[PDB]
């Protein structure tokens, strides 16, 4: 089976700068070489076959060029609907393979979270177990640390993150931080705070009740 | 294995295409049949 | 036009997994496609599992020949996959999926490529029965921020909807997260201006079709 390995893995661009998108094969794969566009809401979409070909509805922003074992898909004047993922795929032998997918996210200016903290549902306290949330809204770039603090007392393993994907006009990052406890436990402290540090955030902001 | 043919194929299209303008058909009958007569 | 695939959620270990995609636009004995099918793992490597023309002839990727079966039902207008002997590492997005035969005296002949695609079917294979979620409030205290919690449900997917589809514009709906419990647990949060708490009645739509549990539960500021 033919290899075929993109580079980058991931990349960022702005609105407008030229992407290049570079598929690498371990022989020569003559030309058949396809691209595909993979966004998260909708169905695959083809772009691009034997290397140059453009199918229609696809904007002529992108546009392949290769041969042999190196290929390379380029987009002109990237706009917003153009952030997503991309495949390489080879038709030349019996079993096609694809790439491995470069994806195409944002780079856009340092934006800080929004912080809030949620509290337990009584009706999930009568279950028996008590989940705390923190939620950080709508932040760029994607690295942020969320710290949990049970009066005073530093917490770790109990707890599970969960981030959505870039938003389609916003460009930016939300991040859930769900702690989940025994009815016990949770019952046990009084002050519960959530820490939050990102590059946007001069001093890390902490939220909280009792 | 078919879809690995094509890719052969595509070759022997192009050579034929060539001789399809250059020795206009008639021809390639005509040298055909030439070649048969010899058998 | 459309390609519409279909099938269980969910299928246990050593099973058969069987997929149908229904078409909707022309006839699968059209004789100018070849029908495919491509999976996508978790680990989002695309395989192809196999194509099948409308005169009968199938090819099959040779890590599955020894068990998978594709084959299309003209008098409904479908194209079936069947997988046998499946594993966990068969859980995947298995998308449906068109290819142009271009007969010899096309400009773009031997060009082998998957000019359509459906939106997909997602599979999970797990011994783990289906398993409806709870559905807490995550209540308010410029702008507020309320939700929904649902909690412990097994298999993917939920989805959750605010107003029926009438509040779409700062709504996140988060991925899922595998608990140590083995079930799995998300959130779904919108950013409202906080002057609406007090008059406009908030609720949410979460769907589990897996357990057939339907939940609307309204978020009301807290107490
Ligand atoms: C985004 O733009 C700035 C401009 O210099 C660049 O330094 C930075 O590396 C970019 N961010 C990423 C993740 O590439
Ligand atoms: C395989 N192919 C015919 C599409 C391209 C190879 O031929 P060529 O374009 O290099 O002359
Ligand atoms: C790519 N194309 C289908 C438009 C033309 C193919 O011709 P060729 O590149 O094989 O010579």
């Known amino acids: 089976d033919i290899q075929m390995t993109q580079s980058p893995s991931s990349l960022s661009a702005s609105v407008g700068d030229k992407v290049t998108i570079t598929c690498r094969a371990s022989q020569s794969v003559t030309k058949y070489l396809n691209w595909y566009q993979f966004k998260t809401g909708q169905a695959p979409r083809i772009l691009i076959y034997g290397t140059y070909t453009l199918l229609s509805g696809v904007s002529p922003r992108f546009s392949g060029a290769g041969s042999g074992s190196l290929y390379t898909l380029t987009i002109t004047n990237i706009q917003p609907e153009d952030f997503a993922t991309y495949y390489c795929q080879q038709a030349h032998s019996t079993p096609w393979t694809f790439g491995q997918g470069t994806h195409v996210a944002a780079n856009r200016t340092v934006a800080a979270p929004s912080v809030f903290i949620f509290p337990p549902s009584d009706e999930q306290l009568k279950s028996g177990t008590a989940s705390v949330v923190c939620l950080l809204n709508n932040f760029y770039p994607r690295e942020a640390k969320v710290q949990w603090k049970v009066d005073n007392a530093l917490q770790s393993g109990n707890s599970q993150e969960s981030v959505t994907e870039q938003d389609s006009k916003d460009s930016t990052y939300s991040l859930s931080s769900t702690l989940t406890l025994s009815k016990a436990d949770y019952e046990k402290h009084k002050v519960y705070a959530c820490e939050v540090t990102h590059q946007g955030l001069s001093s890390p902001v902490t939220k909280s009740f009792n | 294995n078919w879809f690995n043919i094509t890719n052969w194929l595509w070759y022997i299209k192009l050579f034929i295409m060539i001789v399809g303008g250059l020795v206009g058909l008639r021809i390639v009958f005509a040298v055909l049949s030439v070649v048969n007569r010899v058998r | 036009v459309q390609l519409v695939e279909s099938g269980p959620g969910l299928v246990q270990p050593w099973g058969t997994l069987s997929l149908t995609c229904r078409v909707s636009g022309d006839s699968v004995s059209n004789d100018n496609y070849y029908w495919a099918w491509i999976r996508q793992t978790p680990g989002r490597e695309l395989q192809v599992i196999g194509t099948?023309?409308?005169?009968?002839?199938?090819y099959y990727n040779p890590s599955l020949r020894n068990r998978v079966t594709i084959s299309l039902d003209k008098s409904v207008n479908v194209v079936s996959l069947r997988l046998g002997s499946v594993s966990a590492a068969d859980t995947a997005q298995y998308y449906c999926?068109?290819?142009?035969?271009?007969?010899?005296?096309?400009?773009?002949?031997?060009?082998?490529?998957?000019?359509?695609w459906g939106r997909g079917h997602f599979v999970a294979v797990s011994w783990a029965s289906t398993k409806g979620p709870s559905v807490f409030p995550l209540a308010p205290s410029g702008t507020a921020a309320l939700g929904c919690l649902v909690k412990d449900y097994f298999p993917e997917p939920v989805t959750v909807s605010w107003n029926s589809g009438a509040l779409t514009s700062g709504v996140h709906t988060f991925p899922a997260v595998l608990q140590s419990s083995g079930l799995y647990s998300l959130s779904s949060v919108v950013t409202v201006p906080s002057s609406s708490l007090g008059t406009q009645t908030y609720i949410c739509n979460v769907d589990h079709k897996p357990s057939n549990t339907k939940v609307d539960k309204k978020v009301e500021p807290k107490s």
């Open positions: 999926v068109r290819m142009p035969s271009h007969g010899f005296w096309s400009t773009s002949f031997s060009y082998w490529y998957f000019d359509l």
């Open positions: 099948i023309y409308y005169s009968g002839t199938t």
